[PDB]
C-alpha cells in the first residue's frame, strides 16, 4: 500500500494472505467471504506471461494476521486449499478481464474477533454506494512503493473515479467488470495498492445497516501511485452471479 497507515488490530477481519508453502513467500491478498471460501484475483494464481500457474499443492492460506512476518500464535489460522476456481472467461492475454478466483478451504475455519466474513454487494447497495467521489478502503501487506514490505497491515482510503477518467488514463481496454480508484493530479492526496496487494479487498461501509461490503478485488495497475495513473479493481457485484460456484 502506497501512502497508507498501519491498520488497527482487527480492522480487516476478512483479510487473508495467500502464501507459497515452500519456500515461504507472500504471494497475494485475498478475502474471507465465508468460513470456507476465500475470494482473490485470478492473476494471483494464473498468469502465463510471468510463468504463474499455482496449484492447490503449491498454495497455502493464513487468516487473522496483523504482522507480515511474525506467526501470531492463536489469533492466526493457517489452512490449505481444497480446490481452486478461476473464472472461465478470465482474459489474461489482453486486459485481465474477469480477474477473479475462488479458493475453497479444505476444512471450515473457526471465526473469531480477528476472523470474520465480509458482505458481498446486492443491487441496492451497489446502486447506492458505487458513485465517483465516494471513498473505499484497500488493505494489504504489499510494497510501500515500487520495488519496503510493511511489518504491519497497511490501510488506505481511495475515492472511486468516474469511468471516462479511468478509460482516458490508460491504453488497456477497460471493461464494465472493472473500475478504478485513486486521487487525481489536482486532488492533493496520494495512495494506491501495489505489489503484493493483488487479490486484496476494496470495501465500502453502508450507512444503511452499518455493514462492510466488498465492492472490488485489487486487480492490475500500471505502476504504484503514479500521477495520472489509477489502480484497477475487479467489479465484484457484476461477477457475483458467477460467485454459482459456491452452490
Amino acid at each position: 500500500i502506497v501512502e497508507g497507515q498501519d491498520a488497527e488490530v482487527g480492522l480487516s477481519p476478512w483479510q487473508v494472505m495467500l502464501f507459497r508453502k515452500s519456500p515461504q513467500e507472500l504471494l497475494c491478498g485475498a478475502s474471507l467471504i465465508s468460513d470456507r471460501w476465500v475470494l482473490t484475483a485470478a492473476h494471483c494464481l494464473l498468469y502465463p506471461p510471468w510463468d504463474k500457474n499455482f496449484t492447490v499443492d503449491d498454495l497455502l492460506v493464513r487468516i487473522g494476521k496483523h504482522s507480515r512476518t511474525r506467526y501470531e500464535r492463536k489469533v492466526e489460522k493457517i489452512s490449505m486449499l481444497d480446490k481452486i476456481y478461476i473464472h472461465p472467461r478470465y482474459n489474461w492475454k489482453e486486459n485481465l478481464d474477469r480477474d477473479i478466483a475462488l479458493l475453497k478451504l479444505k476444512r471450515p475455519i473457526e471465526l473469531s474477533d480477528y476472523i470474520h466474513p465480509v458482505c458481498l454487494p446486492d443491487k441496492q447497495t451497489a446502486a447506492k454506494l458505487l458513485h465517483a467521489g465516494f471513498k473505499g478502503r484497500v488493505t494489504g501487506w504489499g510494497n510501500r512503493r515500487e520495488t519496503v514490505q510493511p511489518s504491519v497491515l497497511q490501510v488506505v482510503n481511495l475515492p472511486l473515479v468516474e469511468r471516462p477518467v479511468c478509460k482516458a488514463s490508460t491504453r488497456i481496454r477497460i471493461t464494465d467488470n472493472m473500475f478504478c480508484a485513486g486521487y487525481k493530479p489536482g486532488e492533493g492526496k496520494r495512495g494506491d495498492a501495489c505489489e503484493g496487494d493483488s487479490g486484496g479487498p476494496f470495501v465500502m461501509k453502508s450507512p444503511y445497516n452499518n455493514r462492510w461490503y466488498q465492492m472490488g478485488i485489487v486487480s492490475w495497475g500500471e505502476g504504484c501511485d503514479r500521477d495520472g495513473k489509477y489502480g484497477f479493481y475487479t467489479h465484484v457485484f457484476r461477477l457475483k452471479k458467477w460467485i454459482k460456484v459456491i452452490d
Binding site: 497507515q5 488497527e8 488490530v9 482487527g10 480492522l11 477481519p13 467471504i33 473469531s112 474477533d113 480477528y114 470474520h116 466474513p117 465480509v118 458482505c119 467521489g133 465516494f134 471513498k135 473505499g136 478502503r137 490501510v155 482510503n157 475515492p159 465500502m204 461501509k205 453502508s206 450507512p207 445497516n209 452499518n210 455493514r211 462492510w212 461490503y213
Partner: peptide
Amino acid sequence: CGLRPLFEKKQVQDQTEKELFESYI
C-alpha cells in the same frame, strides 16, 4: 457479515472510518 467484532459490534468507529462517511456528503 461486515460487522467487525472489535469495531461495529463494540460500537467503536475506526480511526479512518470518518473519511468514508465524509466522502458520501
